[PDB]
Amino acid sequence: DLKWHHHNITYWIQNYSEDLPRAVIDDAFARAFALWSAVTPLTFTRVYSRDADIVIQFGVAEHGDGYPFDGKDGLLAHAFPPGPGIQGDAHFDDDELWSLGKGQGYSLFLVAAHQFGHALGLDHSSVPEALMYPMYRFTEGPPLHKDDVNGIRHLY
Ligand SMILES: COc1ccc(S(=O)(=O)[C@H](CC(=O)O)C(F)F)cc1
Ligand SMILES: [Ca+2]
Ligand SMILES: [Ca+2]
Numbered sequence: 001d002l003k004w005h006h007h008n009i010t011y012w013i014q015n016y017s018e019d020l021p022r023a024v025i026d027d028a029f030a031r032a033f034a035l036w037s038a039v040t041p042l043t044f045t046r047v048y049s050r051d052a053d054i055v056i057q058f059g060v061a062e063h064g065d066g067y068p069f070d071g072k073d074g075l076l077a078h079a080f081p082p083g084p085g086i087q088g089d090a091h092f093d094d095d096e097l098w099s100l101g102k103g104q105g106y107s108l109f110l111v112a113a114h115q116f117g118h119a120l121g122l123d124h125s126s127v128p129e130a131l132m133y134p135m136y137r138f139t140e141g142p143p144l145h146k147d148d149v150n151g152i153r154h155l156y
């Protein structure tokens, strides 16, 4: 039930997934963030310290928190809402097949954006076409839906 008191959010990519090249992943995340910063006064800067607002980590099964991943399929990832400590960090189940665009596997890009929303304070949308819909479904074109934009703007 909290939001970031600053608009200069920072993120730190802790480790990577074995499914994609590092530069591919970095870009994916950058583009994910870019989506929100585009409709809000928010900015996202990549840092290299635990001090980052949002820390990005890929994991398998137990990974620190009490919500370990379910291996292939199922829970794909999860991000904690705004707050101190672990709050804000986004976790990805490196047991999934991460990719982009058409084809098998889940889009790291689209999933990231979704999770970044949660890490910004956004809650799940009730619209099937919105990016904040709790159900993954690949789509082409603008990821954000009127509902997602209104949401993030009602916050920032
Ligand atoms: C497409 O964006 C996503 C929506 C839901 C998920 S999830 O399967 O991890 C979701 C939990 C979450 O959004 O973190 C669960 F269905 F409740 C991942 C990516
Ligand atoms: Ca899983
Ligand atoms: Ca994987």
Ligand SMILES: [Ca+2]
Pocket: 099, 100, 101, 102, 103, 104, 105
């Ligand atoms: Ca693919």
Ligand SMILES: [Cl-]
Pocket: 014, 015, 016, 017
């Ligand atoms: Cl790594």
Ligand SMILES: [Cl-]
Pocket: 099, 100, 101, 107, 108, 109, 110
């Ligand atoms: Cl994609």
Ligand SMILES: [Zn+2]
Pocket: 063, 065, 067, 078, 091
């Ligand atoms: Zn976690």
Ligand SMILES: [Zn+2]
Pocket: 114, 118, 124, 133, 134
């Ligand atoms: Zn979600």
